[PDB]
Amino acid sequence: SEFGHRTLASTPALWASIPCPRSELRLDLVLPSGQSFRWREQSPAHWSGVLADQVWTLTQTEEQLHCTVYRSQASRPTPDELEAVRKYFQLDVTLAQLYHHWGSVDSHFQEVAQKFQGVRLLRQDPIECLFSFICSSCNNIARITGMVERLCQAFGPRLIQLDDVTYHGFPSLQALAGPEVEAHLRKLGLGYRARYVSASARAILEEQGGLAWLQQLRESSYEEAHKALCILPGVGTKVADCICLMALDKPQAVPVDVHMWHIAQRDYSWHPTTSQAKGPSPQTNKELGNFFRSLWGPYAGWAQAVLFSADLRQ
DNA sequence: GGTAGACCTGGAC
DNA sequence: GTCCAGGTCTAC
Ligand SMILES: [Ca+2]
Ligand SMILES: [Ca+2]
The missing domain is CATH 3.30.310.40 (TATA-Binding Protein)
Structure with missing residues (x-):
């Protein structure tokens, strides 16, 4: 047909x-x-x-x-x-090689990897990644999905239509920075996140040097890239890591959220060393990312995806 | 410098 | 009617 x-x-x-x-x-x-x-x-x-x-x-x-x-x-x-x-x-990256290495240095990864093969990272556009994750804040995947669709529908260019689905390209910086966008986003149910979308869109175009400033991060080190991203409204340590990992080619980047904290404690019996708090805090979260980096290596972020993905399956 | 509380909402015990 | 999900920001 x-x-x-x-x-x-x-x-x-x-x-x-x-x-x-x-x-x-x-x-x-x-x-x-x-x-x-x-x-x-x-x-x-x-x-x-x-x-x-x-x-x-x-x-x-x-x-x-x-x-x-x-x-x-x-x-x-x-x-x-x-x-x-x-x-x-990123099909040139051989997953069988990564799994082998991670499994070699981590017995737990080895047991879990057995059933969850084929988990790799998408090479995403920075803009879409930045705003999609600004929306991930205190949110679940099903809801985030809705917010993102509604957002693209209202401000993204119209593509083709299949059945009753009209596909839209992701909104540009100029569109998201436009007048009254926040209010429009609130009517779409984005909540306080609406404010951050508007604010970051404007921050990038009117203070940081535009799109080129974002895209040039791909050539910058993880350390530099991560620091710049945290300048933006609504972007904390986690959002920045997600962006570095999924859109700026920083495979060693490890996003630390609640999921990863539960994993660290349950499967590795992990506890903060150099940090004060007994639970999640800027110091403990930073330490945990370092723990996984030293355990898995240069592609810790990808390894994280395998467990993070196999964890959501519960 | 390092915690505590407000910010939005819709599936869930 | 209460609780949590790939957090961030800021007051003290
Ligand atoms: Ca920030
Ligand atoms: Ca969190």
């Missing part, structure tokens, strides 16, 4: 594949796990969302990652568009 979301079975000639075994990527463990909030399983095993300014539907078989694009006459994805998918999932 020419309408609605496509499936591999119904529109054979419109899909193209990318060699990728399920052991290197599990869509169902990556896409709805709190990394990106813009993918939906409209059909069983078929996920749709915006990727590289276009709408896609992705699905996998044991050895392949099938992709289709909705842009002109309908056709299969081209080799270059397909490369956009490979980059988004």
Whole structure:
């Protein structure tokens, strides 16, 4: 059929594949796990969302990652568009190598990794990542998802429509910095987070040097990148880490939230050393991130995703 | 310098 | 009718 979301079975000639075994990527463990909030399983095993300014539907078989694009006459994805998918999932990074190493230095990781293979990090756009996580504050994944959709719908450019779903690109800095955005966001239910979206959009354009200032962080060290991000309204130590990890290519970045605290205590019997507090505080949270970095290495953040993801499965 | 309380809301015991 | 989710900000 020419309408609605496509499936591999119904529109054979419109899909193209990318060699990728399920052991290197599990869509169902990556896409709805709190990394990106813009993918939906409209059909069983078929996920749709915006990727590289276009709408896609992705699905996998044991050895392949099938992709289709909705842009002109309908056709299969081209080799270059397909490369956009490979980059988004950072497919050049071998997950089997990472799991092996983490499992070698951490017996607990080894036991948990057995059942949760294919958990990796998406290479996300900084703007979308910054504002999506500004909205994650004291929030759950299902709600965050709603807020983000409503936000893109009201301020993001309109893409194509499939069935009754109209896809929108993520809002630009200029749009989010506009007049009365906060009030509009409050009517959309963002709460106090509405204030931060508006404020950070303006801070970036009117005080930090614009988009270029954000994008240049990819070349800066984790230390430098993380410090700059905390300048923004609504961005604390955690939000900044999420952004460094998921959008600025800092794999050693470890976001410390309540989930990670429960994991550290239960599975590692961890307790703060150099810090005062017995529980969560800026000093203890910083120490915990260091604990995981020294345990897992340069890609501690990715290791964190494997457990964090396998933890949400409870 | 390091804790305590306000800020929004909708699924949940 | 109370409680929590990938926190942040600020007063003292
Ligand atoms: Ca800040
Ligand atoms: Ca927290």
